[PDB]
Coordinates of C-alpha atoms and ligand atoms in Angstrom, one line a residue:
Chain A
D1 CA -33.2 -124.0 19.1
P2 CA -31.0 -121.1 17.8
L3 CA -31.1 -117.6 19.3
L4 CA -33.1 -115.1 17.3
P5 CA -33.1 -117.0 14.0
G6 CA -33.4 -114.7 11.0
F7 CA -32.9 -111.5 12.9
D8 CA -30.7 -108.9 11.1
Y9 CA -28.2 -107.1 13.3
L10 CA -27.8 -103.3 12.7
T11 CA -26.0 -100.4 14.2
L12 CA -27.9 -97.2 13.9
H13 CA -26.3 -93.8 14.1
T14 CA -28.6 -91.3 15.8
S15 CA -28.1 -87.8 16.9
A16 CA -26.8 -88.7 20.4
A17 CA -26.1 -92.5 20.3
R18 CA -24.8 -95.5 18.4
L19 CA -27.6 -98.1 18.9
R20 CA -27.5 -101.9 18.5
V21 CA -30.8 -103.0 16.9
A22 CA -32.0 -106.4 15.6
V23 CA -35.0 -106.7 13.2
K24 CA -37.1 -109.3 11.7
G25 CA -40.6 -109.6 10.1
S26 CA -43.1 -107.6 8.2
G27 CA -46.4 -106.0 9.1
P28 CA -47.3 -103.6 11.9
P29 CA -44.3 -102.5 13.9
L30 CA -43.5 -103.6 17.4
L31 CA -40.5 -102.2 19.4
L32 CA -39.3 -104.4 22.3
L33 CA -37.3 -102.8 25.1
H34 CA -35.3 -104.9 27.6
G35 CA -34.4 -104.0 31.1
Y36 CA -31.6 -104.3 33.7
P37 CA -29.0 -105.9 33.8
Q38 CA -29.8 -107.3 30.4
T39 CA -29.7 -106.7 26.6
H40 CA -32.1 -107.2 23.7
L41 CA -31.4 -110.9 23.9
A42 CA -33.8 -111.1 26.8
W43 CA -36.5 -111.3 24.2
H44 CA -35.2 -114.5 22.5
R45 CA -38.2 -116.6 23.6
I46 CA -40.8 -114.0 22.5
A47 CA -39.5 -112.1 19.5
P48 CA -39.3 -115.0 17.0
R49 CA -43.0 -115.8 17.5
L50 CA -44.0 -112.1 17.1
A51 CA -41.9 -111.8 13.9
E52 CA -44.2 -114.3 12.3
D53 CA -47.0 -111.7 12.2
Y54 CA -45.3 -108.3 12.9
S55 CA -42.3 -106.1 12.1
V56 CA -40.2 -106.7 15.2
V57 CA -37.5 -104.3 16.4
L58 CA -35.2 -105.2 19.3
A59 CA -32.9 -102.5 20.7
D60 CA -30.2 -102.3 23.4
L61 CA -31.1 -99.3 25.5
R62 CA -28.5 -96.4 25.5
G63 CA -25.6 -97.5 27.5
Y64 CA -26.6 -101.1 27.8
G65 CA -25.4 -104.0 25.8
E66 CA -23.7 -102.7 22.6
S67 CA -25.5 -99.3 22.6
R68 CA -23.5 -96.2 23.5
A69 CA -24.0 -92.6 24.0
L70 CA -21.8 -90.4 21.7
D71 CA -21.0 -88.2 24.7
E72 CA -19.0 -90.5 26.9
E73 CA -18.3 -87.9 29.5
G74 CA -21.7 -86.5 30.4
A75 CA -24.4 -88.1 28.4
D76 CA -28.1 -87.9 29.3
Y77 CA -29.4 -91.3 30.4
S78 CA -32.9 -90.1 31.4
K79 CA -35.9 -92.0 30.2
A80 CA -36.9 -89.0 28.1
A81 CA -33.5 -89.2 26.2
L82 CA -33.8 -92.9 25.7
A83 CA -37.4 -92.3 24.5
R84 CA -36.1 -89.9 21.8
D85 CA -33.6 -92.7 20.8
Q86 CA -36.6 -94.9 20.1
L87 CA -38.3 -92.3 18.0
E88 CA -35.1 -91.9 15.9
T89 CA -34.6 -95.6 15.7
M90 CA -38.1 -96.4 14.5
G91 CA -38.1 -93.4 12.2
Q92 CA -34.8 -94.5 10.5
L93 CA -36.3 -98.0 10.0
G94 CA -39.4 -96.4 8.4
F95 CA -42.0 -96.2 11.2
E96 CA -43.5 -93.0 12.6
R97 CA -46.0 -94.9 14.8
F98 CA -45.6 -98.3 16.5
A99 CA -46.4 -100.5 19.4
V100 CA -44.0 -100.6 22.4
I101 CA -43.5 -103.7 24.6
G102 CA -41.2 -103.1 27.5
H103 CA -39.8 -105.0 30.5
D104 CA -38.2 -103.5 33.6
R105 CA -36.3 -100.3 32.6
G106 CA -37.5 -100.7 29.0
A107 CA -41.1 -100.4 30.2
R108 CA -40.0 -97.1 31.8
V109 CA -38.6 -95.9 28.5
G110 CA -41.8 -97.0 26.9
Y111 CA -44.3 -95.2 29.0
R112 CA -42.2 -92.0 29.0
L113 CA -42.2 -92.3 25.2
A114 CA -46.0 -92.7 25.1
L115 CA -46.5 -89.7 27.4
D116 CA -44.0 -87.4 25.6
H117 CA -44.9 -88.5 22.0
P118 CA -48.4 -89.9 22.0
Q119 CA -48.6 -89.6 18.2
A120 CA -45.9 -92.2 17.9
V121 CA -47.2 -95.0 20.2
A122 CA -50.1 -97.2 18.9
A123 CA -50.2 -99.5 21.9
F124 CA -48.1 -100.1 25.1
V125 CA -47.4 -103.2 27.0
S126 CA -45.7 -103.1 30.4
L127 CA -44.1 -106.3 31.7
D128 CA -44.1 -106.0 35.5
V129 CA -43.6 -102.3 35.8
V130 CA -45.6 -99.3 37.1
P131 CA -44.5 -95.7 36.8
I132 CA -41.6 -94.6 39.0
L133 CA -43.7 -92.0 40.7
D134 CA -45.9 -94.8 42.1
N135 CA -42.8 -96.9 43.1
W136 CA -41.4 -94.0 45.1
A137 CA -44.6 -93.5 46.9
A138 CA -44.5 -97.2 48.0
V139 CA -41.0 -97.0 49.7
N140 CA -40.9 -98.6 53.1
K141 CA -38.5 -100.8 55.1
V142 CA -39.4 -104.0 53.1
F143 CA -39.3 -102.2 49.7
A144 CA -35.8 -100.8 50.4
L145 CA -34.4 -104.1 51.6
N146 CA -35.9 -106.0 48.6
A147 CA -34.8 -103.3 46.1
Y148 CA -31.6 -102.1 47.9
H149 CA -30.0 -101.6 44.5
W150 CA -32.4 -98.9 43.6
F151 CA -30.7 -96.9 46.4
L152 CA -27.2 -98.1 45.9
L153 CA -27.0 -97.5 42.2
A154 CA -28.5 -94.0 42.6
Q155 CA -25.7 -92.8 45.0
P156 CA -23.5 -90.0 43.5
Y157 CA -20.8 -90.8 41.0
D158 CA -18.6 -92.9 41.5
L159 CA -19.6 -94.7 44.6
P160 CA -21.7 -97.5 43.1
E161 CA -19.4 -97.8 40.0
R162 CA -16.5 -98.5 42.4
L163 CA -18.5 -101.2 44.3
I164 CA -20.1 -103.0 41.4
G165 CA -17.0 -102.7 39.3
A166 CA -14.7 -104.6 41.6
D167 CA -15.9 -108.1 40.6
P168 CA -18.4 -107.4 37.8
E169 CA -19.3 -111.1 37.1
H170 CA -19.9 -111.8 40.7
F171 CA -22.4 -108.9 41.0
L172 CA -24.1 -109.7 37.7
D173 CA -24.5 -113.3 38.4
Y174 CA -25.8 -112.6 42.0
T175 CA -28.3 -110.1 40.6
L176 CA -29.6 -112.3 37.8
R177 CA -30.1 -115.2 40.2
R178 CA -31.9 -113.0 42.7
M179 CA -34.2 -111.4 40.1
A180 CA -35.1 -114.9 38.8
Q181 CA -35.9 -116.1 42.4
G182 CA -33.3 -118.8 41.8
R183 CA -35.2 -120.2 38.8
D184 CA -33.1 -121.7 35.9
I185 CA -34.3 -119.3 33.2
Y186 CA -31.1 -117.9 31.5
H187 CA -30.0 -119.4 28.3
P188 CA -26.2 -119.9 28.7
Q189 CA -25.4 -118.0 25.6
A190 CA -27.7 -115.1 26.4
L191 CA -25.9 -115.1 29.8
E192 CA -22.5 -114.6 28.1
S193 CA -23.9 -111.6 26.4
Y194 CA -25.2 -110.0 29.6
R195 CA -21.8 -110.8 31.2
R196 CA -19.7 -109.2 28.5
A197 CA -21.8 -106.0 28.6
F198 CA -21.5 -105.8 32.4
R199 CA -17.7 -106.2 32.2
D200 CA -17.6 -102.9 30.4
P201 CA -17.2 -100.0 32.8
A202 CA -19.2 -97.7 30.5
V203 CA -22.2 -100.1 30.7
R204 CA -22.0 -100.2 34.5
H205 CA -21.8 -96.4 34.6
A206 CA -24.8 -96.1 32.2
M207 CA -26.8 -98.4 34.5
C208 CA -26.0 -96.2 37.5
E209 CA -27.0 -93.2 35.5
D210 CA -30.4 -94.9 34.8
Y211 CA -31.0 -95.4 38.5
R212 CA -29.9 -91.8 39.2
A213 CA -32.4 -90.5 36.6
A214 CA -35.1 -92.6 38.2
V215 CA -34.7 -90.7 41.5
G216 CA -34.4 -87.3 39.8
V217 CA -35.5 -86.2 36.4
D218 CA -37.6 -89.3 35.6
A219 CA -39.7 -88.8 38.7
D220 CA -40.0 -85.1 38.0
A221 CA -41.4 -85.8 34.5
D222 CA -43.9 -88.3 35.9
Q223 CA -45.0 -85.7 38.5
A224 CA -45.4 -83.0 35.8
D225 CA -47.7 -85.4 33.8
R226 CA -49.7 -86.2 36.9
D227 CA -50.0 -82.5 37.6
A228 CA -51.2 -81.8 34.1
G229 CA -53.6 -84.7 34.0
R230 CA -51.7 -86.1 31.0
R231 CA -52.3 -89.8 30.4
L232 CA -51.2 -92.4 27.9
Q233 CA -53.5 -92.1 24.8
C234 CA -53.2 -95.7 23.5
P235 CA -54.4 -99.0 24.7
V236 CA -52.3 -100.4 27.6
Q237 CA -51.7 -103.9 28.7
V238 CA -49.9 -104.7 32.0
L239 CA -48.7 -108.2 32.8
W240 CA -47.6 -108.4 36.4
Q241 CA -46.0 -110.9 38.8
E242 CA -48.5 -112.8 40.8
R243 CA -47.9 -111.6 44.4
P244 CA -49.8 -109.7 47.0
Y245 CA -50.2 -105.9 46.4
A246 CA -50.9 -103.4 49.1
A247 CA -53.8 -101.0 48.7
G248 CA -53.1 -98.5 45.9
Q249 CA -50.3 -100.7 44.6
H250 CA -52.0 -103.2 42.4
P251 CA -50.6 -102.7 38.9
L252 CA -53.9 -102.7 37.1
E253 CA -55.2 -100.1 39.5
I254 CA -52.1 -98.0 39.0
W255 CA -52.2 -98.1 35.2
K256 CA -55.8 -97.1 35.2
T257 CA -54.7 -93.8 36.9
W258 CA -52.3 -93.2 34.0
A259 CA -54.4 -94.4 31.0
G260 CA -58.1 -94.6 30.0
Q261 CA -57.8 -97.9 28.2
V262 CA -56.1 -100.6 30.3
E263 CA -56.2 -104.4 30.6
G264 CA -53.9 -107.0 32.1
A265 CA -53.3 -110.2 33.9
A266 CA -51.2 -111.8 36.6
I267 CA -48.5 -114.3 35.6
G268 CA -47.1 -116.9 38.0
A269 CA -43.4 -116.2 37.5
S270 CA -40.5 -114.1 38.7
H271 CA -40.1 -110.5 37.7
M272 CA -38.1 -111.8 34.6
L273 CA -41.2 -112.4 32.6
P274 CA -39.7 -112.5 29.1
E275 CA -37.3 -115.4 30.0
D276 CA -39.4 -117.1 32.8
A277 CA -42.9 -117.1 31.3
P278 CA -42.6 -116.6 27.5
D279 CA -45.6 -118.7 26.6
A280 CA -47.9 -117.0 29.0
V281 CA -46.6 -113.6 27.9
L282 CA -47.1 -114.5 24.2
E283 CA -50.6 -115.7 24.7
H284 CA -51.6 -112.4 26.3
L285 CA -49.6 -110.3 23.9
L286 CA -50.9 -111.9 20.8
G287 CA -54.5 -111.5 22.0
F288 CA -54.0 -107.8 22.9
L289 CA -52.3 -107.0 19.6
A290 CA -55.0 -108.8 17.6
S291 CA -57.8 -107.1 19.6
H292 CA -56.4 -103.7 18.9
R293 CA -55.5 -104.4 15.3
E294 CA -57.4 -101.2 14.3
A295 CA -55.3 -99.1 16.8
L296 CA -52.2 -100.4 15.0
Chain B
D1 CA -2.3 -82.9 72.3
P2 CA -1.8 -86.6 72.8
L3 CA -4.6 -89.2 72.2
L4 CA -6.2 -90.5 75.4
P5 CA -3.4 -89.5 77.8
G6 CA -3.2 -91.8 80.8
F7 CA -5.7 -94.4 79.6
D8 CA -4.8 -98.0 80.4
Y9 CA -5.3 -100.4 77.5
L10 CA -6.8 -103.8 78.5
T11 CA -8.0 -107.0 76.8
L12 CA -10.9 -108.6 78.6
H13 CA -11.8 -112.2 78.1
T14 CA -15.5 -112.7 78.5
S15 CA -17.8 -115.6 77.9
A16 CA -18.2 -115.0 74.1
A17 CA -15.7 -112.3 73.2
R18 CA -12.2 -110.9 73.6
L19 CA -12.8 -107.1 74.1
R20 CA -10.5 -104.1 73.8
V21 CA -11.1 -101.7 76.6
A22 CA -9.3 -98.5 77.7
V23 CA -9.9 -97.1 81.2
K24 CA -9.0 -94.0 83.2
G25 CA -10.2 -92.1 86.3
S26 CA -11.9 -92.7 89.5
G27 CA -15.4 -92.0 90.8
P28 CA -18.8 -93.0 89.4
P29 CA -18.5 -95.3 86.4
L30 CA -19.3 -94.2 82.8
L31 CA -19.2 -96.6 79.8
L32 CA -18.7 -94.9 76.4
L33 CA -19.8 -96.9 73.3
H34 CA -18.7 -95.8 69.8
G35 CA -20.5 -96.5 66.5
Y36 CA -19.9 -97.2 62.9
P37 CA -17.4 -97.4 61.2
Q38 CA -15.2 -96.4 64.2
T39 CA -13.6 -97.6 67.3
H40 CA -13.3 -96.3 70.9
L41 CA -10.8 -93.7 69.7
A42 CA -13.9 -91.7 68.5
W43 CA -14.1 -90.5 72.2
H44 CA -10.7 -88.9 72.3
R45 CA -12.0 -85.4 72.6
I46 CA -14.5 -86.2 75.3
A47 CA -13.1 -89.1 77.5
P48 CA -10.1 -87.2 79.0
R49 CA -12.3 -84.5 80.4
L50 CA -14.8 -87.0 81.8
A51 CA -11.9 -88.9 83.4
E52 CA -11.1 -85.9 85.6
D53 CA -14.3 -86.6 87.6
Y54 CA -15.5 -90.1 86.7
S55 CA -14.3 -93.7 86.1
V56 CA -14.3 -93.8 82.4
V57 CA -14.4 -97.1 80.4
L58 CA -14.1 -97.0 76.6
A59 CA -14.7 -100.3 74.7
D60 CA -14.5 -101.5 71.1
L61 CA -17.9 -103.1 70.3
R62 CA -17.8 -106.8 69.5
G63 CA -16.4 -107.2 66.0
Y64 CA -15.3 -103.6 65.7
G65 CA -11.8 -102.3 66.3
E66 CA -9.8 -104.9 68.2
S67 CA -12.8 -106.7 69.8
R68 CA -13.7 -110.0 68.5
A69 CA -16.2 -112.7 69.0
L70 CA -14.8 -116.1 70.1
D71 CA -17.1 -117.8 67.5
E72 CA -15.6 -116.6 64.3
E73 CA -18.0 -118.7 62.2
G74 CA -21.5 -117.8 63.5
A75 CA -21.3 -115.3 66.3
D76 CA -24.2 -113.3 67.6
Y77 CA -23.8 -109.6 66.8
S78 CA -27.3 -108.5 68.0
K79 CA -27.5 -105.5 70.3
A80 CA -28.7 -107.9 73.1
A81 CA -25.4 -109.9 72.8
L82 CA -23.3 -106.7 72.8
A83 CA -25.3 -105.5 75.8
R84 CA -24.3 -108.6 77.7
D85 CA -20.7 -107.9 76.7
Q86 CA -21.0 -104.6 78.5
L87 CA -22.5 -106.2 81.6
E88 CA -19.5 -108.6 81.7
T89 CA -17.0 -105.9 80.9
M90 CA -18.2 -103.5 83.6
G91 CA -18.6 -106.4 86.1
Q92 CA -15.0 -107.6 85.6
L93 CA -13.8 -104.0 86.2
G94 CA -15.8 -103.9 89.4
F95 CA -19.1 -102.1 88.5
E96 CA -22.6 -103.7 88.7
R97 CA -24.3 -100.3 87.9
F98 CA -23.0 -97.6 85.7
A99 CA -24.0 -94.8 83.3
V100 CA -23.9 -95.4 79.5
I101 CA -23.1 -92.8 76.9
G102 CA -23.4 -94.1 73.3
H103 CA -23.0 -92.7 69.8
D104 CA -24.5 -94.3 66.7
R105 CA -24.4 -98.1 67.0
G106 CA -23.1 -97.8 70.5
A107 CA -26.3 -95.9 71.6
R108 CA -28.2 -98.8 70.2
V109 CA -26.2 -101.2 72.4
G110 CA -26.8 -98.8 75.2
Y111 CA -30.6 -98.5 75.1
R112 CA -30.9 -102.3 74.6
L113 CA -28.7 -102.7 77.7
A114 CA -30.9 -100.3 79.7
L115 CA -34.1 -102.1 78.6
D116 CA -32.9 -105.7 79.2
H117 CA -30.9 -104.9 82.4
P118 CA -32.4 -101.9 84.1
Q119 CA -30.7 -102.6 87.4
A120 CA -27.3 -102.0 85.7
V121 CA -27.9 -98.7 84.0
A122 CA -27.9 -95.6 86.2
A123 CA -28.3 -93.0 83.4
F124 CA -28.3 -93.1 79.6
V125 CA -27.1 -90.6 77.0
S126 CA -27.9 -91.1 73.3
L127 CA -25.8 -89.1 70.8
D128 CA -27.9 -88.6 67.7
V129 CA -29.8 -92.0 67.9
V130 CA -33.4 -93.1 68.4
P131 CA -34.6 -96.7 68.7
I132 CA -34.4 -98.7 65.5
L133 CA -38.2 -99.4 65.7
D134 CA -38.7 -95.7 65.2
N135 CA -36.2 -95.5 62.4
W136 CA -37.8 -98.3 60.4
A137 CA -41.2 -96.6 60.7
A138 CA -39.6 -93.5 59.1
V139 CA -38.4 -95.2 55.9
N140 CA -39.3 -93.4 52.7
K141 CA -37.6 -92.5 49.5
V142 CA -35.3 -89.8 51.0
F143 CA -34.4 -91.9 54.1
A144 CA -33.4 -94.9 51.9
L145 CA -31.2 -92.7 49.6
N146 CA -29.6 -90.9 52.5
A147 CA -29.1 -94.1 54.5
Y148 CA -28.6 -96.5 51.6
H149 CA -26.0 -98.4 53.5
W150 CA -28.6 -99.5 56.1
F151 CA -30.1 -101.5 53.2
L152 CA -26.9 -102.6 51.5
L153 CA -25.1 -103.9 54.6
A154 CA -28.2 -105.8 55.7
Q155 CA -28.3 -107.9 52.5
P156 CA -27.6 -111.6 53.0
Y157 CA -24.1 -112.9 53.5
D158 CA -21.8 -112.3 51.6
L159 CA -23.2 -109.7 49.2
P160 CA -22.2 -106.6 51.1
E161 CA -18.9 -108.1 52.3
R162 CA -17.9 -108.7 48.7
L163 CA -18.7 -105.1 47.7
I164 CA -17.3 -103.2 50.6
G165 CA -14.2 -105.5 50.8
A166 CA -12.9 -104.9 47.3
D167 CA -11.3 -101.5 48.2
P168 CA -11.8 -101.2 51.9
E169 CA -9.9 -97.9 52.4
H170 CA -11.9 -96.2 49.5
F171 CA -15.2 -97.2 51.1
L172 CA -14.1 -96.3 54.7
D173 CA -12.8 -92.9 53.6
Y174 CA -15.9 -92.2 51.5
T175 CA -18.2 -93.1 54.4
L176 CA -16.4 -91.1 57.0
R177 CA -16.3 -88.0 54.8
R178 CA -20.1 -88.4 54.1
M179 CA -21.0 -88.9 57.7
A180 CA -19.0 -85.8 58.6
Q181 CA -20.7 -83.8 55.9
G182 CA -17.2 -83.0 54.6
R183 CA -16.1 -81.4 57.8
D184 CA -12.4 -81.8 58.8
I185 CA -13.1 -83.6 62.1
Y186 CA -10.9 -86.8 62.0
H187 CA -7.6 -86.7 63.9
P188 CA -5.2 -88.3 61.4
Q189 CA -4.0 -90.8 63.9
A190 CA -7.6 -91.9 64.9
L191 CA -8.2 -92.3 61.2
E192 CA -5.4 -94.8 60.9
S193 CA -7.0 -96.8 63.6
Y194 CA -10.4 -96.8 61.9
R195 CA -8.6 -97.7 58.6
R196 CA -6.7 -100.7 60.1
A197 CA -9.9 -102.1 61.6
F198 CA -11.8 -101.8 58.3
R199 CA -9.0 -103.5 56.4
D200 CA -9.8 -106.6 58.5
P201 CA -12.4 -108.8 56.7
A202 CA -13.7 -110.0 60.1
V203 CA -14.5 -106.4 61.1
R204 CA -16.3 -105.7 57.9
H205 CA -18.3 -108.9 58.4
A206 CA -19.2 -107.9 62.0
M207 CA -20.4 -104.6 60.7
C208 CA -22.7 -106.2 58.2
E209 CA -23.9 -108.5 61.0
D210 CA -24.8 -105.4 63.0
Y211 CA -26.8 -104.0 60.2
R212 CA -28.5 -107.4 59.6
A213 CA -29.5 -107.6 63.3
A214 CA -30.9 -104.1 63.1
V215 CA -33.4 -105.3 60.5
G216 CA -34.2 -108.4 62.3
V217 CA -33.7 -109.4 65.9
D218 CA -33.0 -105.9 67.2
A219 CA -36.3 -104.5 65.8
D220 CA -38.1 -107.5 67.2
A221 CA -36.7 -106.8 70.6
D222 CA -37.8 -103.2 70.4
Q223 CA -41.3 -104.2 69.4
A224 CA -41.6 -106.7 72.3
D225 CA -40.7 -103.9 74.7
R226 CA -43.2 -101.6 73.1
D227 CA -45.8 -104.3 73.3
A228 CA -45.0 -104.9 76.9
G229 CA -45.0 -101.1 77.7
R230 CA -41.4 -101.6 79.0
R231 CA -39.4 -98.3 79.2
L232 CA -36.0 -97.2 80.2
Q233 CA -36.0 -96.8 84.0
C234 CA -33.1 -94.2 84.3
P235 CA -32.7 -90.6 83.4
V236 CA -32.1 -90.2 79.7
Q237 CA -30.4 -87.4 77.8
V238 CA -30.5 -87.2 74.0
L239 CA -28.3 -84.8 72.0
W240 CA -29.3 -84.6 68.4
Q241 CA -28.2 -83.1 65.2
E242 CA -29.9 -79.7 64.5
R243 CA -32.0 -80.4 61.4
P244 CA -35.7 -80.5 60.6
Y245 CA -37.7 -83.5 62.0
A246 CA -41.0 -84.7 60.5
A247 CA -44.0 -85.1 62.8
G248 CA -43.4 -88.0 65.2
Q249 CA -39.7 -88.1 64.4
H250 CA -38.3 -85.4 66.8
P251 CA -35.7 -87.2 69.0
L252 CA -36.9 -85.7 72.2
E253 CA -40.5 -86.7 71.4
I254 CA -39.4 -90.2 70.5
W255 CA -37.3 -90.7 73.6
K256 CA -40.3 -89.6 75.8
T257 CA -42.2 -92.5 74.4
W258 CA -39.4 -94.9 75.6
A259 CA -38.6 -93.3 79.0
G260 CA -40.3 -91.3 81.7
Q261 CA -37.3 -89.0 82.5
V262 CA -35.9 -87.4 79.3
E263 CA -34.0 -84.2 78.5
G264 CA -31.9 -83.1 75.6
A265 CA -30.7 -80.5 73.2
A266 CA -29.9 -79.8 69.6
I267 CA -26.3 -79.5 68.5
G268 CA -25.2 -77.7 65.3
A269 CA -22.9 -80.3 63.9
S270 CA -22.9 -83.4 61.8
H271 CA -24.0 -86.9 63.0
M272 CA -20.4 -87.4 64.3
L273 CA -21.0 -85.6 67.5
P274 CA -18.1 -86.9 69.6
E275 CA -15.5 -85.7 67.1
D276 CA -17.4 -82.7 65.5
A277 CA -18.9 -81.0 68.6
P278 CA -17.0 -82.3 71.7
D279 CA -17.2 -79.0 73.7
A280 CA -20.9 -78.7 73.2
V281 CA -21.4 -82.4 74.0
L282 CA -19.2 -82.1 77.2
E283 CA -21.1 -79.0 78.4
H284 CA -24.4 -80.9 78.2
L285 CA -23.0 -84.2 79.5
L286 CA -21.3 -82.8 82.5
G287 CA -24.4 -80.9 83.5
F288 CA -26.6 -84.0 83.1
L289 CA -24.3 -86.2 85.1
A290 CA -24.0 -83.5 87.8
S291 CA -27.8 -83.0 88.0
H292 CA -28.4 -86.8 88.4
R293 CA -25.5 -87.3 90.8
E294 CA -27.9 -89.1 93.2
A295 CA -29.0 -91.5 90.4
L296 CA -25.3 -92.4 90.0
Ligands
CL301 CL1 -38.0 -101.7 36.9
CL302 CL1 -27.1 -95.3 64.1

């Protein structure tokens, strides 16, 4: 089967970025946002099916893949900035209000977009992500061992850039295998795209900047919303990895503290839901989008 | 001033290691144990003064500096194994019972030695270290950011070896500056010795193995002692960095849960007490050793 058949590849010029986007379909708009260390190609098992019924927009996050900040010295890689990129992207394409489906860092862009710009987000789906404020509250020995890179990549410039940049393909391949729990989920051609992006020192730097923002400004934004009692205003679906969750850490429970309309389900796969469990994800997504068709 | 004037450099052949040792003095024996990413030369501002009144033994920990495990494929780098190296070292030199002064990883060797072999340890001094069990209980977001390397270096073989090995001098120099809080504390000739050790891939691997053991077997040993109610049997002194401590985390408080005879003081310096605050350390050490002369 070919990758993203019928998708039209665009480069959008926005106020602060040059963004790679791929689009297909007609009907209500959906924006799909990948995570780390990937690109929009992570959606290749999901996006074709959705494009049969919806307007589907796939984007590389600022700094990832083929998307770049225009300021290559000191750009803002906070989730708030990347959320504004999404508003500009969808606006240019003709959409002022749209559903957002995110995985990993893209879910973090997505919920920040929903909180900051509730008029723009019709529905939100998180694939195996809860807000960073909740993650930081969960840090203990096992968390920090499991997610050591959250701490490495957030160290001050240029410590992690120097380490991860020495043998970029080794580190990329190690990371993808680990995130997949050793499962054979990566299409060899999607892999080459992830590899080429990671060989670019600007991409690696942007990734570090994402992780620095997660520690700092992104967490501060989440706290300000929590302080204000601000919640997502749209229907929310969370699809999470089947694993044990400590008290207070179950993703459905967490999302119910951030939104009044929440549903979800466990999926028996790795964290890499788009590539590992696309049929299960599709079944849940299609049902959610159909059930909230009025919201769209 | 010359480095370690009058110290006699030896290589000891023990059951499991070839150990670099430097000795000077006469009288009651003291064993001084450096930490990461250093060698016995870290004691150069302290050991000469002590050798005026005591038998002073400086050792490179197994795998650090010029000390090596005989098994270079699968050696044991647990604190228990390095504690046995100390028993063999001091025994070969003519001492069955001795005081131990440790800094950083060497304090961790030291307290494990005192717990496992209480008949051998007359007195114990910890420079800015508490037991690893207590450290792990303290892990939160800020701990993991500050001490990110505790999590990096404990990742499975050969992830951290690959990262830290790419540009060893960059990583060593970064780490030393950070641990010193930017203070100009490293004698340029001691530095060259730390650098040469870190350029050896076997040393870097042994360091990773230390950090892996800290997560695993070392913590398990501490828990077994806590479960058994086993405490250090000798007088203990702890000299700690002056900084705020959360409830339960003050080093004097912690050591009092591990030993019935504890004293200590705060020192206004970085974590690198031997090099940063040698006069303050000496004043406290000399008074402690003199006050417990009978124990010796
Ligand atoms: Cl994530
Ligand atoms: Cl330590």
